[PDB]
Design a protein around this nucleic acid. Structure first.
Lengths: 88, 115, 226, 94, 61
RNA sequence: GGUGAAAUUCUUGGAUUUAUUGAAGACUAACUACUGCGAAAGCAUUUGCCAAGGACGUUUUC
């Protein structure tokens, strides 16, 4: 289970950056052939994907996935399993 | 004084279908597609083409005399998404605008158990 | 290859097909309500229960704006939305079904209430059936969030959609194109294709969409294969 | 949450969104006392006490999120033991 | 001694249910005064000595 | 049909959609879950049959 951008290598990243620079240059031959942009550039350049109510990330603790108990006291009707009836 | 004919609507992300059919389902009154209203392939997902197709289907039903229509909305289903398309709501509201009564509204989107 | 396709001169390019008209009580020319009452029922997990206990009246108030009855029964553990006689909009019951599904899938109510708008649309993606192993499932679910939520924010910047990853479901609220893109990202992430692989492709697609000349041509030559 | 609960009532009628119960226990509950299920989960508050001395009934006003049609015959409803009063208190003094 | 007309919200399944309930509540009873009454609302035991169902109509309820 | 736009394919012989019948393989939608179970693999339709366990207590030809 690759989780550090295995297929997207450094050479592939450099090629994608060169293609992006060629697109930003708006060359005719290339065409024929705070700020969210700053945050995206910081995420891309510093490899933020690699590990070390408008939106979810605005709320605090958006990183943690909240886990819950498998048993709760509640008003919900619970049907007994056939195994428990057989034991009884 | 009330004529019931089920109007089955296909609300996909790519296009929309309207299909006026008898209550038994054996005999179909009329059919119309999003691509029939608009020549562009990208405009098949557009709400305006779905509204035009719904208006044409409602005119055909009024010619057939269908006073009220039961509606069954059915998404892409299966392994694909279950969200109804943009044009389904617009065509349902267009059928409301046409003056036909709206009967029972149920969802017939197919869901698999797994895989 | 649209073979045997007839022309459509009645279509106008000046008309905005993406525009959505509002609805009113006098919009329907029938003048009569729905013949049969239509209801939609969903279940919710037990851990949501108490939160629903504190929000439901407010939820009712929202449905009071759209003349839709609602009921929440804890013993069945179900929430049902029903159309009323004063209801005049046929799709608002579907939007209420979307609302109760989003509320069951742990989307908070200040965010979930916006599904009643015509523009918004929701998609709930099931991720429990992709991989059977628990550790691999947890790891691939953490790939979507990443460290400190950052790539998740990038996914928001990819789609302009509210994305919430809870348990076995990913809930996405936003425009239809963003819904399809995040569906692609979530399914490919559960099939162990990394989220940044699609994030970079979406960034390149946005840069290609910036130029109309590149938008006219195929993006597959410029974009890297994945 | 209550420390202990006692068998207060048995389900009889769901009328008008409130639970009618035969009083199994031999003492009279407080007005607006919380009614629980045996997992000590609050279902509603006592709304009305009625019926003759030999057969006492009480009506529970259900809390929000609880529906009266969800229950069935033979169900039991529980109350904290502090919320009870002797029957001879309401009887006339000698 | 009163003569009272009771209005039922829904029709009974059988007519003798009202008579059975009327003879059920004959005797000592637990009552709380309504909010309209000027006295304080407290649970008291009051005796209904006799009762008799003069008439009952399901259609008129 | 699908795409950002596309494109390959299917067909006025009926593509697509809807309704029914027959056959085949697969799965058990919501509740549902990194707090349950299992050594791992993995595991929720009903009904039975079979074998074995986990935690607790009493202990052991220990």
């Amino acid at each position: 289970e690759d989780d550090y951008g295995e297929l997207i290598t450094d050479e592939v990243e450099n090629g994608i950056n060169q293609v992006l620079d060629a697109i930003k240059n708006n060359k005719t031959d290339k065409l024929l052939d705070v700020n969210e942009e700053n945050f995206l550039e910081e995420f891309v350049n510093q490899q933020a994907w690699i590990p070390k109510y408008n939106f979810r990330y605005e709320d605090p603790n958006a990183a943690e996935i909240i886990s819950y108990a498998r048993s709760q006291a509640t008003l919900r009707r619970s049907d007994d399993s056939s195994r428990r009836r057989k034991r009884e | 004084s009330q004529v019931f004919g089920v109007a089955r609507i296909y609300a996909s992300f790519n296009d929309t279908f309207v299909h006026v059919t008898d209550l038994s389902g054996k005999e179909t009154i009329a059919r119309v597609t999003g691509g029939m209203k608009v020549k562009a392939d990208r405009d098949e997902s557009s709400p305006y083409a779905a509204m035009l197709a719904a208006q044409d289907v409602a005119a055909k039903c009024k010619e057939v005399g269908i006073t009220a229509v039961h509606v069954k909305i059915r998404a892409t289903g299966g392994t694909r998404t279950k969200t109804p398309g943009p044009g389904g709501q617009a065509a349902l509201r267009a059928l409301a605008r046409s003056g036909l009564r709206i009967g029972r509204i149920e969802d017939v989107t197919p869901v698999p158990s797994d895989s | 290859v649209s073979t045997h396709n007839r022309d459509k001169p009645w279509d106008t390019d000046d008309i905005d097909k993406w525009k959505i008209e509002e609805f009113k009580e006098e919009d329907n020319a029938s003048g009569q309500p729905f013949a049969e009452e239509s209801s939609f029922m969903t279940l919710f997990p037990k851990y949501r229960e108490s939160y629903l206990k504190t929000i439901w009246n407010d939820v009712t108030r929202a449905l009071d704006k759209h003349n839709i009855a609602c009921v929440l029964d804890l013993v069945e553990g179900s929430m049902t939305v029903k159309t009323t006689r004063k209801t005049y909009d046929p799709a608002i019951i579907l939007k209420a079904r979307d609302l109760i599904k989003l509320l069951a899938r742990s989307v908070p109510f200040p965010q979930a209430v916006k599904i009643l708008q015509d523009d918004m649309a929701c998609d709930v993606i099931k991720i429990g059936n992709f991989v059977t192993n628990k550790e691999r499932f947890v790891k691939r679910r953490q790939r979507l969030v990443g460290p400190n939520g950052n790539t998740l924010k990038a996914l928001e910047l990819l789609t302009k959609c509210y994305i919430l990853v809870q348990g076995n479901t990913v809930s996405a609220m936003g425009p239809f194109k963003g819904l399809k893109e995040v569906r692609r990202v979530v399914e490919d992430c559960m099939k162990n294709i990394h989220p940044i692989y699609h994030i970079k492709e979406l960034m390149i697609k946005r840069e290609l969409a910036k130029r109309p000349e590149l938008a006219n041509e195929d993006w597959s030559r410029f974009l890297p294969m994945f | 949450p209550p420390d202990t609960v006692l068998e207060m009532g048995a389900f009889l009628h769901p009328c008008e969104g409130d639970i009618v119960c035969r009083s199994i226990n031999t003492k009279i509950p407080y007005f607006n006392a919380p009614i629980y299920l045996e997992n000590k989960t609050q279902v509603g508050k006592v709304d009305e006490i009625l019926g003759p001395l030999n057969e006492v009934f009480f009506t529970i006003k259900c809390g929000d999120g609880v529906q009266a049609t969800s229950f069935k015959e033979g169900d039991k409803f529980y109350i904290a033991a502090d919320k009870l009063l002797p029957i001879e208190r309401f009887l006339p003094k000698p | 001694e009163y003569v009272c007309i009771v209005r039922l919200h829904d029709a009974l399944k059988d007519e003798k249910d009202l008579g059975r309930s009327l003879e059920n509540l004959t005797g000592a009873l637990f009552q709380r005064p309504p909010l309209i009454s000027a006295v304080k609302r407290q649970l008291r035991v009051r005796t209904i000595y006799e009762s008799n169902l003069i008439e009952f109509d399901n259609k008129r309820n």
